[PDB]
Structure 1
Amino acid sequence: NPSNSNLQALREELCTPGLDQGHLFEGWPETVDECNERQIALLTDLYMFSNMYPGGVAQYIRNGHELLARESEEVDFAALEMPPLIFEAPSLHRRTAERTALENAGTAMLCKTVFVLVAGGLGERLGYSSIKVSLPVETATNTTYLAYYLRWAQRVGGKEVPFVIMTSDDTHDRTLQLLRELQLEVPNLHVLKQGQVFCFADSAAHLALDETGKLLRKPHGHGDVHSLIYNATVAQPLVNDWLAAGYESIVFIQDTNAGATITIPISLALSAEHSLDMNFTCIPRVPKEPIGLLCRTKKNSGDPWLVANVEYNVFAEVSRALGFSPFPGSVNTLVFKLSSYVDRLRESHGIVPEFINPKYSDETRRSFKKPARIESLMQDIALLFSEDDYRVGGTVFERFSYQPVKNSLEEAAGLVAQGNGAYCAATGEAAFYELQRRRLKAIGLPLFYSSQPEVTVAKDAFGVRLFPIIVLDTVCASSGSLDDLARVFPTPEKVHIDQHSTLIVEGRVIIESLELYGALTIRGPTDSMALPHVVRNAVVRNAGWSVHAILSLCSRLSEVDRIRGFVLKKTAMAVMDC
């Protein structure tokens, strides 16, 4: 594609003072024509970078110099305080007039929402070698995070719901594989793959090479989501299509937090009630947490206020220089008014402020432990919304609604020892089952069960309980609002599920009355508009399921089993079909 003179022009450019990439052509022939295949490929690699990064590799080097200098300084703001626009969401487990009104309004708003899933990571840190969205939300049904989000989105937004998945080189192919394998059919899905950026070997921004003599590449961060979206097309920009179809909101969700399907409707309702252009999903945080604070900030004494996410370390350091915190913690579920989001997008080309964070060998010598690269964060899009022209706020939810799976069993053990949340696969799964129970109790289902743990994991570090397990699919439970749950159980007081039981429900099912001592699956029509399978005067008793810890001695044991430390034994199961 690029001409020889172009590659030659770039090569000479990269050798000029201030760019100084001479080390890349050490021992090369004078002109392009004389260069071999490998050399021609390297120059083309450098040249093509321009279709990926504004200003190409030359501008990438300059930004590197600017950021490397910037990060050598102390981050500090002239002012830091509470965001003016913070709103408390009502509890997810109390069916109040307010909660009903917000779920109602929010659910209707879901019909005009674009959904964006950030999924560029493998689960290696967790102990899982595949893509994080292929993790099961729970092992009773083994429904993947990917299917869980997509089926919910198609339920609340219809089959044609606009959906974006951001992938990376690590996850892209495997994601397309999973979509096909799960037979997910999502007409308006767009899978956008982030491009990796070049790396700096040193503090002077000399470009790094890999083990094979090729330019090294690393992730540019999830800030890429915005530029991927801005550049996406259907000759029409993707966003133009959304706007023209009457879409009014856009929401960004993380890969392994099932809680989002509960918080999102509330956030939408509150964004409308309080006219918020950007709405951070928050939880109350204790001063000892690896989540950022939502702060009102002012970089320099003259600057206007900006409402953005600020990391703990930074926050503490800025305080001095100038039982939860007064400041909420951001879970990175971001809710936008679409028109505002698009306006900011168009003005910036989806470019959010960047930074660099090199890992050094020592505390002085300033040598890189590994090559560094420029990064950006998806939440930093907030910096593009001035207080003068936009309203940016936070909605504070119960900490229980935040259920990420992000730590390994070993890490969780250490964290718990320090009084911090485990946020591992064991607690993610247990929290999902408990979430279903709290929601069902809110509509009057009489669930009585022990709060004691049923299995202990991580070398007897902590315990979780699982039962009773109750999992309703999207055809059965629809959006999962309390009203939708009440449709499944019209006379809740007649449904008696023993604490050791398992109830799995798929399809258009209505349960009027049931006595369950064991495991039961009820299946109804897969078509939400078909006549429901109604269950009345059912009495089911069997051996049911059980759960036990994986012994240290340890086989059909997979990574999925080992990362949670226990296994369900699915010994017996009754089935009620047509």
Structure 2
Amino acid sequence: NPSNSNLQALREELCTPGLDQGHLFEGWPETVDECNERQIALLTDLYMFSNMYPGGVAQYIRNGHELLARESEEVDFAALEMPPLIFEAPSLHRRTAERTALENAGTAMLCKTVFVLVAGGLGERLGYSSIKVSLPVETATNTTYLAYYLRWAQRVGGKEVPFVIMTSDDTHDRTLQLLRELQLEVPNLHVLKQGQVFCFADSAAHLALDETGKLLRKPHGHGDVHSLIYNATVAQPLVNDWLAAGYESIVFIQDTNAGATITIPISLALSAEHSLDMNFTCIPRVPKEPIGLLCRTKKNSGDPWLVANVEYNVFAEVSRALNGFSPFPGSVNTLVFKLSSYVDRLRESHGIVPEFINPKYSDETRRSFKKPARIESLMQDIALLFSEDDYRVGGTVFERFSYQPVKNSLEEAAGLVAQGNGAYCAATGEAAFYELQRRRLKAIGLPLFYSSQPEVTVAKDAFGVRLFPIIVLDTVCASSGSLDDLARVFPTPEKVHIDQHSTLIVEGRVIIESLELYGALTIRGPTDSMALPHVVRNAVVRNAGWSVHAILSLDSRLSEVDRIRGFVLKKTAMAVMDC
């Protein structure tokens, strides 16, 4: 679709001063006809980038110059202090009137919430060769992150809940595969794939080629979600459709943090109470960790205050000069917006947000790259488009325990923990999930007594976790997971006695009035949320149950999934109560 001469015009353009991409056409004919398909592919690839990126490859290159220039100086702000609008969430594990009030208000708002999942990233770190959303939240049920979010959203927002997943060339096909394999039926799901952008071989923004002689490419960061949304249609823009259907909020979540289903209702309630246009999910931050800081900022001496995330790496550089937790809250990138305000800023900017570049240098001396570098962007930087004059931007501070990402391999985690840092590995992610259920259930009066000692040690005796007792209630059973919803499952919790070594798995419409459990038990009820619940009374269950042991340093059934957590559950015995 591009003029054979239009390709020639772009090639000439790219050789001009300030663009200087001649090294791309080294040893080429004069015109387009004489070029092999492998050369027209590149020249075409360069031409098409225009519909993927504002100003095409020429502007990409200019932007690189502008960013790389800036990448020899020290980041600095004229001013930095605490954001004016910061609110502290009540504890997730105390059923106070306030918590009850916030959960109820927040849970009602879930009916009018659009959900967005950014899942284009690889997280090269883990020891896991498949996509992050295919990781199990926990291995008792092996429910994937993808299923976990989607089933929760359809539970709180109905089957027709609006749901966006951003994929990339790294995750797209496997994400569609998983959707199909899981038999997930989500009528208003939209899968939007972010584009690839070019890499710079050097500090002069010369485009990088690979071995086969083709242009090297990477995605442009989680920042692209806003433009994908802006350009998406359902001949009507997606966001118009949402607004017309009466949707009032939009929430952005990341690929491996199961905590979001707990924090989100509270954030919605507080946004409403405090009229927040944008509401950053925060936690108290420990000095070293890879989460940004929520700050009130002024980049230059004359500017207006601007509430925004300052990334950990940048705060690390801003810190050591310009003047047990950090002075400002840590931002975990569950982002909660008032939909109408979100859309207004989206329409103004076309979803375009500030960009940056962060080259990894080979040595400490030269502007020489250890690997090619591309321009990036952060989805949270849309905050910069919300002036303090026109908008209310704030943070809600939750318990650190509510932030449970799976980011690090066991070896990094051991290294992190050895320096007293957060592990954020698969083992602590699964263990945190089980403990979270237990804290919530105790909050409504379930008498769980259990040891705090670890039961298995991972990463060559670096640290231990514990798993038991394991209690996992599905979305039909637990509905939204609010404390009121959990109380519906256990109407008389003082009669339910689950031993510390037990496993209780509950699926479908179930009420448990009274139970003595020493062992493992699955209880299944009607999958139809609107059916007559299967009620359990005076149940007494005892069997060998389950156990856990470490994968030893030494017909193998161990998968990467087992290996990245360093232990395996042995699912020895299991009673089943169906009906």
Please state if 1:325 is matched with 2:326: yes
How big is each residue's C-alpha offset from its partner over 1:118-139, in whole Å with a ceiling of 9 and x where there is no partner? Answer: 1113354111100000000000
Superposed CA offset, 1:226-256 (max 9, x none): 1111111111111111111110100000111
Q: CA deviation at 1:315?
A: 2.9
* 1:313 to partner: Cα distance: 4.4
| Structure 1 residue 290, shift from structure 2 partner | 2.0
1:333 deviation in Å? 0.6
Q: Counterparts of 1:285 and 1:23 in 2: how far apart (Å)?
A: 46
Contact 1:221 1:377 in 2 (8 A): yes
Moved more, 90-99 or 201-210: 201-210
In 2, Cα distance between equivalents of 1:476 and 1:49: 48
Q: CA deviation at 1:472?
A: 0.1
* Counterpart Cα distance in 1 of 2:435 and 2:89: 20
Question: Conserved in 1, the CA contact under 8 Å of 2:230 and 2:346?
Answer: yes
SS where residue 445 of structure 1 aligns?
coil
What do the CA deviations read for 1:181-228 (whole angstroms, capped 9, x no partner)?
000000000111111101111111111111111111112111011111
Q: CA shift at 1:428, angstroms?
A: 0.5
| SS in structure 1 of the partner of residue 434 of structure 2 | helix
Where 1:190 maps in the other structure, the secondary structure is strand
3-state SS of 2:413 partner: helix
Distance verdict in 2 for CA 1:34–1:320, change over 3 Å: closer
Bigger drift between 554-563 and 503-512 goes to 554-563
Once the two structures are TM-superposed, the CA of residue 387 in structure 1 deviates from its matched residue by: 0.5
Is the Cα–Cα contact under 8 Å of residues 478 and 486 in structure 2 kept in the other structure?
A: yes
Question: Are 2:276 and 2:392, in contact at CA under 8 Å, matched by a contact in 1?
Answer: yes
In the alignment, is the contact (CA less than 8 A) between 1:127 and 1:563 conserved in 2? Answer: yes
Give the 3 Å change call, closer, same or farther, for CA 206–240 of structure 1 in structure 2: same
Give per-residue Cα distances to partners, 1:60-103, cap 9 Å, x unaligned: 11111111101122210110110000000000000000000000
Contact 2:195–2:219 (8 Å) recurs in 1? yes
- How far apart, CA to CA, are the structure 2 residues paired with 1:489 and 1:295? 42
Offset at residue 34 of structure 1 (A): 2.0
- Give 1:33 shift: 1.8
Matches within 5 A, 1:479-518: 479-518=480-519
1:521-556 per-residue CA deviation (whole Å, 9 max, x = no partner) reads 000000000100001111101010011011100910
The secondary structure found in structure 1 opposite 2:320 is helix
Task: Spell out, residue by residue over 1:394-418, the C-alpha distance to the aligned partner (whole angstroms, 9 max, x if none).
Answer: 0000000000011011111111111
**C-alpha distance in 1, partners of 2:320/2:28?**
53
Matched, 1:255 2:255: yes
- How far did 1:318 drift? 3.3
How far apart in 2 are the matches of 1:200 and 1:313? 21
Checking the alignment, whether the CA contact within 8 Å between 2:74 and 2:318 is kept in structure 1 is: no
Report if the CA contact (8 A) 1:543-1:572 is conserved. yes
Query: Is residue 199–residue 208 contact of structure 1 (8 Å, CA) maintained in 2?
Result: yes
Shift of 1:2: 0.4
Taking the aligned partners of 2:575 and 2:499, their CA distance within structure 1 comes to 15
Would the aligned equivalents of 1:85 and 1:393 in 2 still touch at CA under 8 Å?
Answer: yes
Q: Report the 3-state secondary structure (helix = DSSP H, G, I; strand = E; otherwise coil) of the residue aligned with 2:130.
A: strand
Offset of residue 288 of structure 1: 2.7
How far did residue 7 of structure 1 move?
Answer: 0.8
Cα shift readout 1:153-196 (whole Å, capped 9, x = no counterpart): 00000000000111111110000000000000000001111111
Instruction: Measure the CA separation in 1 of the matches of 2:567 and 2:239.
Output: 44
Query: Structure 1's 189 and 29: CA in aligned 2 closer, same or farther, altered over 3 A?
Result: same
Residue 123 of structure 1 aligns to a residue whose secondary structure is coil
Q: Is the 8 A contact 2:88 2:396 kept in 1?
A: yes
Deviating more after overlay: 297-306 vs 313-322: 313-322
Rounded to whole Å, the distance in 1 between the matches of 2:239 and 2:133 is: 25
Structure 1 residues 173 and 444: alpha-carbon distance in aligned structure 2, compared to 1, 3 A threshold: same
CA distance in 2, matches of 1:537, 1:514: 6
Deviation at 1:41, TM superposition (A): 1.3
Shift, 1:457, TM fit: 0.7
TM-superposition CA deviations, 1:330-360 (whole Å, max 9, x none):
1111000111111111111111000111111
For residue 460 of structure 1, give the secondary structure of its aligned residue in structure 2: coil
What is the DSSP-based 3-state SS (H/G/I as helix, E as strand, rest coil) of the residue aligned with 2:390?
coil
> Aligned equivalents of 1:234 and 1:248: distance in 2?
18
1:18 match = 18
In 2, the alpha carbon distance for the partners of 1:340 and 1:47 equals 35
Aligned partners of 2:413 and 2:422 also within 8 Å: yes
Deviation for aligned residue 1:320: 5.8
Q: 1:315 to 1:37 in 2, by over 3 A?
A: closer
Deviation (angstroms), 1:108? 0.3
In the alignment, is the contact (CA less than 8 A) between 1:122 and 1:128 conserved in 2? no
Contact kept? 1:275, 1:391, Cα under 8 Å: yes
Determine if contact 1:122/1:129 at 8 Å carries over to the other structure: no
* CA–CA distance in structure 2, aligned partners of residues 288 and 212 of structure 1: 40
Q: List per-residue Cα deviations over 1:493-528 (Å, max 9, x = no partner).
A: 011101110000000000001110100000000000
The CA distance in 2 between the partners of 1:72 and 1:241, in whole Å, is 45
Equivalenced residue count is: 578
Within 5 Å, give how 1:56-75 maps onto structure 2: 56-75=56-75
Deviation at 1:286, TM superposition (A): 2.2
CA contact (8 A) 1:249 1:336 kept: yes
Identity of aligned residues (%): 100
Q: Distance in 1 between matches of 2:398 and 2:477?
A: 26
Q: CA RMSD in A?
A: 1.1
Moved more, 482-491 or 553-562: 553-562
2:125 alignment partner, SS class = helix
Aligned to 2:234: 234
Query: Comparing 152-161 with 369-378, which one deviates more in the overlay?
Result: 369-378
Equivalent residue of 1:39, what SS?
helix
Whether the aligned pair in 2 keeps the contact of 1:123 and 1:129 (CA below 8 Å) is: no
Equivalent position SS for 1:372: coil
Say if 1:318 and 1:41 are closer, same or farther in 2 by CA, change over 3 A: closer
Decide whether the 8 Å contact of 1:134 with 1:178 is kept in 2. Answer: yes
Alignment partner, residue 137 of structure 2: 137
Distance (Å, rounded) in 2 between the aligned partners of 1:52 and 1:413: 41
Measured after TM superposition, the shift of residue 316 of structure 1 is 5.0
CA shift at 1:31, angstroms? 1.3
SS across alignment from 1:129: coil
Q: Structure 1 514/51 Cα, relative in aligned 2: closer, same or farther at 3 Å? A: same
Q: 1:423 to 1:316 in 2, by over 3 A?
A: closer
Residue ranges of structure 1 left out of the alignment (5+ in a row) = none
Partner Cα distance (2:139, 2:375) in 1: 38
**Counterpart Cα distance in 2 of 1:95 and 1:458:** 37
Q: Distance in 2 between matches of 1:344 and 1:17?
A: 36
If the length of structure 2 is used for normalisation, what is the TM-score? 0.98
Alpha-carbon distance, 1:366 to partner: 1.1
CA contact (8 A) 1:124 1:130 kept: no
Q: Which residue of 2 aligns with 1:548?
A: 549
Classify 1:150/1:465 alpha carbon distance in 2 versus 1 (closer, same or farther; 3 Å).
same
Tell me how far 1:565 sits from its aligned partner: 0.6
Q: Whole-Å Cα distance in 2 between the matches of residues 529 and 554 of structure 1?
A: 45
